[PDB]
Design a protein around this ligand. Sequence first.
Ligand SMILES: O=C(c1cc(Cc2n[nH]c(=O)c3ccccc23)ccc1F)N1CCCNCC1
Length: 357
Amino acid sequence: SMKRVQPCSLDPATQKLITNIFSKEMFKNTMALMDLDVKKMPLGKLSKQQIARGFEALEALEEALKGPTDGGQSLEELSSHFYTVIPHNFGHSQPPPINSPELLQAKKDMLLVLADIELAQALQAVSEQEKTVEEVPHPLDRDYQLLKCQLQLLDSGAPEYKVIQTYLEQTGSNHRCPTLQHIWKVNQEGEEDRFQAHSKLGNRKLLWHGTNMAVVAAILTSGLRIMPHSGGRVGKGIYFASENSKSAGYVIGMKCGAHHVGYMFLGEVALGREHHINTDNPSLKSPPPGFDSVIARGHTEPDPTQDTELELDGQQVVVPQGQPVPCPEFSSSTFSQSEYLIYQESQCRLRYLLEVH
Ligand SMILES: O=C(c1cc(Cc2n[nH]c(=O)c3ccccc23)ccc1F)N1CCCNCC1
């Protein structure tokens, strides 16, 4: 009646990673960091229904914000309802009334993150196959399997190692230097099929995607997703950066003794015909007709003459390798750094996962 736990098959680096991204503490920290009341709303109580009800509250809230004094219920009152569904903590003071587009998008962001934490929580739920079996896998092995995603750790002697590292350092911040620790090759199986579609679609680049640790698991499972209610300076799509230092701004650092651990994805993106804008536009949901991507061109770009290429699945993929240089053409843009945009999930394939300090 005493089931056996089998020895773990994973190496140390991958154990740490799996530990981190499923860590209850890490999840609770993220929630606290978003002013969520963790005691009034425990990880094991997070439901998709609550999150849905949460979203509805923001929707109604938006109708009031956009609608010129409609005549319905006030922002103050409608906010109270939102907080009633999704408990907040501010040192036991009255939660702040949502009364601005900025704040409306703030709560949507949090709800979207919370959503991927719940996704991770439901992922760990014990099934029946795991109960009828008399020999259970090492907890880390099991969680890793729940991902349904091959993560293969690379080393100093991997073809794409000196490349991903040169990319990292030249584009990163000159001073607050980010430090490479580990690189995992990511074969998210389930993306392979739908990505085949754009095989004729050229112009492929390897771009950065910074993310806080709370959703990393969710992404390793479902891939990058165009979510409802997600907005940005370039509209509703999946955002990428060519400059590392841009994406790392979105990598919330989690403490581990003396160092701050962080994870970043590298993605293969089928950009195709690029549409270059130099001004904000939060209303875009697709490129202009004839275009496959939109690129908010910043004041600088990794020296294009230093570009190199890798071969991923028979395809040449562009990898930036130079320090950012000025682009005189876009010296007056509203973007400091480039923001690459695709508006269909299929144009993106996760290739690499990094740990930095
Ligand atoms: O990439 C985004 C997105 C990102 C951002 C910010 C952001 N996040 N992360 C980045 O690496 C990044 C890079 C360049 C520009 C922005 C970013 C804002 C709104 C978003 F909709 N997605 C939206 C959220 C869900 N998961 C898929 C991706």
